[PDB]
Structure 1
Amino acid sequence: RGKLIAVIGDEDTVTGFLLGGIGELNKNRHPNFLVVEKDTTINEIEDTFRQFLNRDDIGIILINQYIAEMVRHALDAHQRSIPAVLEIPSKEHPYDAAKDSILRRAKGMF
C-alpha cells in the first residue's frame, strides 16, 4: 500500500506494464508513467526521471537499456537502496550484461 512501481518506456512497454495493473494518479494527479518516443527530448526525460525519484511514494523504477543510456550519468549518479532503479531488456533493446549499475557495483567478481 506504501509504494508504487514506476514506468518510463516506449508505447509498447508502457501499454504492457499498465496492463500489468500498476499506475496511479498522485496528489497533483500526474501519471505514474511517462511516454518516451523518437519525438521526446532529453531534458524532458531527465526532468521527469528526477520528478519521479523525488516523489518518495514510488519506490521502484523501471527503465530499459536505451532510456537509461541516454541519461547515463544521471543514472549512475544514484547510489541508494530504497528508491531502486531497474535495468530491464527490451524487444527493441535486448539486454547487454556488461551494462548495469548494480553489476557495476559488483564489477570485478567473475
Structure 2
Amino acid sequence: RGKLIAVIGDEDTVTGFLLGGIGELNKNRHPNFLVVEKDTTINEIEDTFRQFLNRDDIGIILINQYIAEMVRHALDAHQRSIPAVLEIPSKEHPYDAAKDSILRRAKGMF
C-alpha cells in the first residue's frame, strides 16, 4: 500500500506545501495537516501529532522547527521505527538542526 506525508505548521509553510501538492483528506474528511494559528493551544498541536504518528495513511510528519520545540515532550517521546518526523525551518523561525533529537545521538558527529 501507499502512504502520505502530513504537516503541522504556520499558515505560510502549510500554504507552500499545499501548492507543492501535499494536501489530502482522509475518508473521515480529516485533513493531513494542521494550520497552527497563533490562538491554537499546545493540546491541539500535541493531539494532532499523536493522531498523525498513530494514523495508518501517514508515513512521514513535517513539523515547523518552532512548533517542534513547543511539542518537544511528545516529539522526543515518539520512538517508533517506521513513522518518521522532520523539524523544518521557516521565515520568522529557527535553523534546520536546532536541538535536533537524532543528531544528538551520534558519536561520529563533529
User: TM-score, with normalisation over the residues of structure 2?
Assistant: 0.90
- Contact kept, 8 Å, 1:10 with 1:37, in 2: the verdict is yes
What is the CA distance between 1:27 and its match in structure 2? 2.1
Distance 2:16 2:45 in 1: 20
Distance 1:98 1:17, change over 3 A: closer
Distance 1:98 1:34, change over 3 A: closer
Secondary structure in 2 matching 1:98: coil
- Contact kept, 8 Å, 2:4 with 2:59, in 1: the verdict is yes
Distance 1:107 1:15, change over 3 A: farther
Structure 2: tracts of 5 or more residues without a match: none
Distance 1:107 1:101 in 2: 13
Distance 2:107 2:11 in 1: 33
Whether 1:40 aligns to 2:21 is no
Q: Deviations over 1:74-101 (max 9, x none)?
A: 1111123320000111111131634111
Secondary structure in 2 matching 1:51: helix
Distance 1:33 1:73 in 2: 20
Distance 1:98 1:32 in 2: 25
User: TM-score, with normalisation over the residues of structure 1?
Assistant: 0.90
Distance 2:85 2:8 in 1: 11
Structure 1: tracts of 5 or more residues without a match: none
- Contact kept, 8 Å, 1:56 with 1:83, in 2: the verdict is no
What is the CA distance between 1:35 and its match in structure 2? 1.1
Runs of 4+ in structure 1 deviating by more than 3 angstroms, as ranges, are: none
What is the CA distance between 1:107 and its match in structure 2? 5.7
Distance 1:47 1:98, change over 3 A: closer
Q: Deviations over 1:16-73 (max 9, x none)?
A: 0000001211121101111102111111111111111111211111112111111111
How many residues are paired up?
Answer: 110
**CA RMSD of the aligned region, Å?**
1.6
